[PDB]
Design a protein around this motif. Structure first.
Motif, mmCIF file in Angstrom:
data_model
loop_
_atom_site.group_PDB
_atom_site.id
_atom_site.type_symbol
_atom_site.label_atom_id
_atom_site.label_comp_id
_atom_site.label_asym_id
_atom_site.label_seq_id
_atom_site.Cartn_x
_atom_site.Cartn_y
_atom_site.Cartn_z
ATOM 1 N N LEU A 127 0.807 -1.218 0.000
ATOM 2 C CA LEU A 127 0.000 0.000 0.000
ATOM 3 C C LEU A 127 0.837 1.262 0.000
ATOM 4 C CD1 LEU A 127 -2.792 -0.992 2.516
ATOM 5 C CD2 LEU A 127 -2.926 -0.835 0.032
ATOM 6 N N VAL A 175 -0.816 -3.164 7.546
ATOM 7 C CA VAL A 175 0.272 -3.415 8.483
ATOM 8 C C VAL A 175 1.465 -2.553 8.111
ATOM 9 C CG1 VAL A 175 1.778 -5.216 9.472
ATOM 10 C CG2 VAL A 175 -0.575 -5.778 8.740
ATOM 11 N N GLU A 223 6.319 5.998 17.494
ATOM 12 C CA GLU A 223 5.033 6.036 16.809
ATOM 13 C C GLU A 223 4.029 5.046 17.421
ATOM 14 O OE1 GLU A 223 3.228 6.475 12.330
ATOM 15 O OE2 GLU A 223 4.750 4.918 12.542
ATOM 16 N N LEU A 278 -4.453 6.939 20.839
ATOM 17 C CA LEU A 278 -5.478 7.499 19.963
ATOM 18 C C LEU A 278 -6.649 6.531 19.779
ATOM 19 C CD1 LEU A 278 -3.129 9.283 17.461
ATOM 20 C CD2 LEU A 278 -4.193 10.129 19.564
ATOM 21 N N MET A 295 2.921 -2.705 13.289
ATOM 22 C CA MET A 295 1.690 -2.099 13.781
ATOM 23 C C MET A 295 0.569 -2.479 12.830
ATOM 24 S SD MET A 295 2.318 1.847 14.963
ATOM 25 C CE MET A 295 3.721 2.051 13.870
ATOM 26 N N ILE A 296 -0.635 -2.654 13.356
ATOM 27 C CA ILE A 296 -1.760 -3.093 12.542
ATOM 28 C C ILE A 296 -2.926 -2.151 12.690
ATOM 29 C CG2 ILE A 296 -3.373 -4.942 12.163
ATOM 30 C CD1 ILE A 296 -1.304 -6.670 13.764
ATOM 31 N N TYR A 298 -8.130 -1.627 7.462
ATOM 32 C CA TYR A 298 -7.969 -1.312 6.052
ATOM 33 C C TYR A 298 -9.090 -0.371 5.603
ATOM 34 C CZ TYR A 298 -7.762 -1.833 0.956
ATOM 35 O OH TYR A 298 -7.747 -1.620 -0.405
ATOM 36 N N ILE A 345 -8.530 10.251 10.334
ATOM 37 C CA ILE A 345 -7.333 11.084 10.230
ATOM 38 C C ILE A 345 -6.091 10.274 10.561
ATOM 39 C CG2 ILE A 345 -6.257 13.244 10.924
ATOM 40 C CD1 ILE A 345 -8.903 14.252 11.882
ATOM 41 N N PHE A 358 0.732 10.648 7.305
ATOM 42 C CA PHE A 358 1.641 9.926 6.440
ATOM 43 C C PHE A 358 3.101 10.353 6.531
ATOM 44 C CE2 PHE A 358 -0.639 7.151 3.420
ATOM 45 C CZ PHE A 358 -1.955 7.441 3.731
HETATM 46 C C1 LIG Z 1 -2.455 9.503 13.549
HETATM 47 N N1 LIG Z 1 -1.140 9.032 13.106
HETATM 48 C C2 LIG Z 1 -1.057 8.101 12.082
HETATM 49 O O1 LIG Z 1 -2.081 7.662 11.531
HETATM 50 C C3 LIG Z 1 0.364 7.673 11.692
HETATM 51 N N2 LIG Z 1 0.366 6.520 10.813
HETATM 52 C C4 LIG Z 1 0.083 5.147 11.367
HETATM 53 N N3 LIG Z 1 0.043 4.329 10.117
HETATM 54 C C5 LIG Z 1 -0.269 2.907 10.201
HETATM 55 C C6 LIG Z 1 -0.285 2.106 9.039
HETATM 56 C C7 LIG Z 1 -0.506 0.721 9.125
HETATM 57 C C8 LIG Z 1 -0.716 0.144 10.368
HETATM 58 C C9 LIG Z 1 -0.715 0.938 11.507
HETATM 59 C C10 LIG Z 1 -0.490 2.324 11.434
HETATM 60 C C11 LIG Z 1 -0.104 5.201 8.902
HETATM 61 C C12 LIG Z 1 -1.495 5.018 8.251
HETATM 62 C C13 LIG Z 1 -1.546 5.631 6.854
HETATM 63 N N4 LIG Z 1 -0.423 5.088 6.057
HETATM 64 C C14 LIG Z 1 -0.549 4.224 4.947
HETATM 65 O O2 LIG Z 1 0.443 3.947 4.273
HETATM 66 C C15 LIG Z 1 -1.872 3.669 4.529
HETATM 67 C C16 LIG Z 1 -2.240 3.869 3.174
HETATM 68 C C17 LIG Z 1 -3.426 3.370 2.679
HETATM 69 C C18 LIG Z 1 -4.250 2.674 3.582
HETATM 70 N N5 LIG Z 1 -5.497 2.067 3.441
HETATM 71 N N6 LIG Z 1 -5.908 1.516 4.628
HETATM 72 C C19 LIG Z 1 -4.945 1.762 5.545
HETATM 73 C C20 LIG Z 1 -3.882 2.480 4.942
HETATM 74 C C21 LIG Z 1 -2.673 2.974 5.414
HETATM 75 C C22 LIG Z 1 0.865 5.612 6.534
HETATM 76 C C23 LIG Z 1 1.070 4.985 7.920
HETATM 77 C C24 LIG Z 1 -0.033 6.602 9.483
HETATM 78 O O3 LIG Z 1 -0.273 7.645 8.921
#
Ligand SMILES: CNC(=O)CN1CN(c2ccccc2)C2(CCN(C(=O)c3ccc4n[nH]cc4c3)CC2)C1=O
Length: 291
Positions: A14, A46, A64, A71, A91-92, A95, A162, A165
């Motif tokens: 992703l 993930v 992180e 949250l 981290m999970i 989707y 929210i 990235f």
């Molecule tokens: C509030 N702080 C955060 O959210 C920080 N973090 C935590 N984090 C995360 C990612 C996986 C597992 C656990 C945490 C992300 C989520 C968005 N990201 C993705 O790449 C992404 C893209 C398309 C997706 N579709 N469904 C889910 C998607 C996720 C960047 C990493 C992030 O911004």
């Protein structure tokens, strides 16, 4: 307690981070783990740190996890689980099948009543959910610092969460202002005092929410201050500080009624304490979406 890592089945990639990757996975034999809809592939996202990641990368990852762990709100990314007692660190999260909100909205047009589209009330519902998430963050005295549609994810039925990235995605490179040896800065979303003094607060998150609301009402089809250079946007911050009536604002989107635009303008008030609190922003948009 660690999530059972062996139950995570890779499906596709992703996202490419600098030191990590985000994968789409299935969870094998899903209901064995529930503290999922019957006969359907339970998908999760993930974030995984590479086994050869540096000390610095690993440190940032562990922080992180701590941040994500607290949250807990329907419109903020949720930590479903971790795999951190051994490597690679994981981290999970849920989707969100419709990807980032900027891409999602960009693929929609405002419905023409005279007759994929999106309705005005639905646009407000999108915005209200963003405000509800920020309302939550405000109660924790958590400052986001990079609120924008590119940082929001979209699931089914226009549900929004929210995220954050980071500033490194190629697709959004033009939204960040880079100087050697300094913090990368999303200047077009930043309150004047952030640009001038590096001061990020909930009140500057309110300003960024104003810009995010403007994005939503533009259906993500134009960059804020899009016809101005990075330098002119920074100069504009200077004009807010100077307060001689030369500062400029984003214009009213075609899809945005004047009353709603007046609320946006309030988010961009020079004085931080005059920007509406998120509890009021949410109330306004949820009343208007409901009625
Ligand atoms: C509030 N702080 C955060 O959210 C920080 N973090 C935590 N984090 C995360 C990612 C996986 C597992 C656990 C945490 C992300 C989520 C968005 N990201 C993705 O790449 C992404 C893209 C398309 C997706 N579709 N469904 C889910 C998607 C996720 C960047 C990493 C992030 O911004």
């Amino acid at each position: 307690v660690d999530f059972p890592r062996s139950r995570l089945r890779f499906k596709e990639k992703l996202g490419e981070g600098q030191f990590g990757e985000v994968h789409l996975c299935e969870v094998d034999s899903p209901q064995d783990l529930v503290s999922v809809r019957k006969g359907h592939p339970l998908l999760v996202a993930v974030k995984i740190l590479r086994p050869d990641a540096t000390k610095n990368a690993r440190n940032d990852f562990l922080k992180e996890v701590k941040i994500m762990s607290r949250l807990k709100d329907p419109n903020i990314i949720r930590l479903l689980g971790v795999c951190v007692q051994d490597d690679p660190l994981c981290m999970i999260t849920d989707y969100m099948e419709n990807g980032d909100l900027n891409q999602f909205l960009s693929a929609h047009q405002l419905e023409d009543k005279a007759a994929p589209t999106i309705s005005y009330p639905m646009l407000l519902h999108v915005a209200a959910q963003i405000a509800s998430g920020m309302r939550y963050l405000a109660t924790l005295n958590f400052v986001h610092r990079d609120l924008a549609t590119r940082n929001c994810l979209v699931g089914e039925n226009f549900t929004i969460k929210i995220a954050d990235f980071g500033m490194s995605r190629n697709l959004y490179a033009g939204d960040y202002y880079r100087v050697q040896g300094r913090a990368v800065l999303p200047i077009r979303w930043m309150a004047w005092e952030c640009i001038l003094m590096g001061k990020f607060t909930t009140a500057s998150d309110v300003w960024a929410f104003g810009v995010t609301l403007w994005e939503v009402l533009m259906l993500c089809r134009a960059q804020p201050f899009g016809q101005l250079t990075d330098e002119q946007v920074i100069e504009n911050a200077g004009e807010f500080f100077r307060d001689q009536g030369r500062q400029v604002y984003l214009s009213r989107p075609p899809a945005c009624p004047q009353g709603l635009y007046e609320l946006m303008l309030r988010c961009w008030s020079r004085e931080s304490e005059q920007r509406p609190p998120f509890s009021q922003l949410h109330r306004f948009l949820a009343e208007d979406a409901l009625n």
